[PDB]
Amino acid sequence: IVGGYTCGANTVPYQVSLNSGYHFCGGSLINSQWVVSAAHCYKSGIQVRLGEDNINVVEGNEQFISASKSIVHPSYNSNTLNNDIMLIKLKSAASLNSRVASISLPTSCASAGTQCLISGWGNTKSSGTSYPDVLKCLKAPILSDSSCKSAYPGQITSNMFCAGYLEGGKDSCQGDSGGPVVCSGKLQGIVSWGSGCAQKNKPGVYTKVCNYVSWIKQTIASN
Amino acid sequence: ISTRKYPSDWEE
Ligand SMILES: [Ca+2]
Numbered sequence A: 001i002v003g004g005y006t007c008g009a010n011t012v013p014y015q016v017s018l019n020s021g022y023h024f025c026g027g028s029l030i031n032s033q034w035v036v037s038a039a040h041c042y043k044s045g046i047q048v049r050l051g052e053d054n055i056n057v058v059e060g061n062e063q064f065i066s067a068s069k070s071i072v073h074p075s076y077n078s079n080t081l082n083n084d085i086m087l088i089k090l091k092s093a094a095s096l097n098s099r100v101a102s103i104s105l106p107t108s109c110a111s112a113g114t115q116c117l118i119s120g121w122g123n124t125k126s127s128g129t130s131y132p133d134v135l136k137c138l139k140a141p142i143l144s145d146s147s148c149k150s151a152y153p154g155q156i157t158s159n160m161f162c163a164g165y166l167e168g169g170k171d172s173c174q175g176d177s178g179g180p181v182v183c184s185g186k187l188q189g190i191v192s193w194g195s196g197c198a199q200k201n202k203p204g205v206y207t208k209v210c211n212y213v214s215w216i217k218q219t220i221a222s223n
Numbered sequence B: 001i002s003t004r005k006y007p008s009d010w011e012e
Helices: A145-151 A209-222
Strands: A015-019 A023-031 A034-037 A047-050 A063-072 A086-090 A115-120 A136-141 A160-163 A180-183 A186-194 A204-208
Touching: A023 A047, A023 A186, A034 A186, A034 A209, A086 A209, A115 A186, A145 A160, A160 A186, A186 A209, A204 A209
Parallel strands: none
Antiparallel strands: A015 A023, A015 A047, A023 A034, A034 A086, A047 A063, A063 A086, A115 A136, A115 A180, A160 A204, A180 A186, A186 A204
């Protein structure tokens, strides 16, 4: 997260870290056994780390649970990034508590101009690299469909939306992929892609979670 | 299109 702030320990209790001997993506806890992340975050042998703040120090509220199943959307395309969503099933159910909690799915799609909370452990610089120990947060608005498409001609599908600041300086970045965009207490987006980070006229691009709610519930019911 | 995995999408 570039241009954000230190969230505060366990203030985003649905935020998880996906770990392969290092943090590589975020994710969102949607019930005690399932996490939503980005399809491009898929890898075998993932450990899900819940209750984290400082990802490099054991602070006492963590649960580390292996992924037992990873289910990428059937129509994911790694070239276009269309349908960039994955569901991870935990080998055992997380113990839900004040620091490990689910985020609700949407009942409708969000609107342009709605301020959302984006979070993660990704890069905090728009040029170069600085990776935080603790979770970072950013408030950013959903952009209009027309502004999103203007920013990325030919690349925005009906399964994506833009959020952020066209002047630059405030955005998600590498290491934030798969993590949440929460608006009005619902999970509306998944960090997906952008051109650079926090660049002028290059807002963040997010998977539009409201298009997938039936698929998510059906996948959970059958796996 | 640059995905937002750490350290990068291409680096893995
Ligand atoms: Ca920790």
